[PDB]
Amino acid sequence: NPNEVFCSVPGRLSLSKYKVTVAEVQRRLSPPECLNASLLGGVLRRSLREKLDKIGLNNVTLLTSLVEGEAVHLARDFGYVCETEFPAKAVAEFLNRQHSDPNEQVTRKNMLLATKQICKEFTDLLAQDRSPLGNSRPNPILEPGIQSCLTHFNLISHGFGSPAVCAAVTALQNYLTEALKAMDK
């Protein structure tokens, strides 16, 4: 039963507990990570083999330590600070001022507009990711091939990866908006 709560794990980055489903434990034990019982015990912040047995089951970065609930919370907080704290306005003022030739202003505007359109298409694809995460197994809308590659990035990052990429590209998009606004003045 993939949505059974295997256990509840206190967050590593708090100043209470995330549920870890059997589906999440299975993602960790499967490729591409195939965590051993030593690494899985660290993730669960723990015999473990016996509890795996009953429900029926067998390159480390700092992201490998995360339960999916905390990985998603971390990405959400990164997105929040990218939106509310990144100084998109000052970055636009500074970079526009490095391109002051009145004869390059049309080219710069066109490059900024191209960049916004290309970045929006890229983050739209990442929003279409339907990788299983937490107790969720949404039905895919992307072709299986691309979805498979996005799922690979989900599994090595414990869900942090694609949302964190979108968070950063929102700081970039806010720069581009502020740049266009300032140029028009």
Add this chain to the structure above:
Amino acid sequence: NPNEVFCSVPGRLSLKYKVTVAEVQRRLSPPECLNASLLGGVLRRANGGRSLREKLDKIGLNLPRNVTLLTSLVEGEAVHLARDFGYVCETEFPAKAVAEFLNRQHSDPNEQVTRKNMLLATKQICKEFTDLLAQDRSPLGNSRPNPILEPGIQSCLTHFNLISHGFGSPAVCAAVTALQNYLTEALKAMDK
């Protein structure tokens, strides 16, 4: 002495980081102004509060007083996390498959020159943007380099450094590298 080690803190994301007086002073000053309680948590100390306030007061840090998951991090682990994020952006993000997929949504032979000019513009605008983040000289760990940027933009990037404990600009550069790898794969694939 800003580079005096205040204490050493075990990592929260391992399966110890030195904290300088300079780092503690960043936590106690605007924009965060952490109190004894939140600072105690950052330093992962087990009255603890009375002991911490004494230790601070003795090295000349004043402590009478929005918290994110980043607020929990010592600067050495924040920088390690951004480095690991950038590593998986470079080595694990499927930039090639993303390029193949997105190029196929624009297969009209008369739009190919426009799409290529849009991808080249994006690479150049993103490079200017990450070159600026590389020019950030925000104090971090035991480092206090001479700034090379204007003071105004450096104070704004420093604000982003302080709220993110050093994670923020490196992590933005990590993500934009994934984007840059997509753009390069999309150009390569179009020319084939």
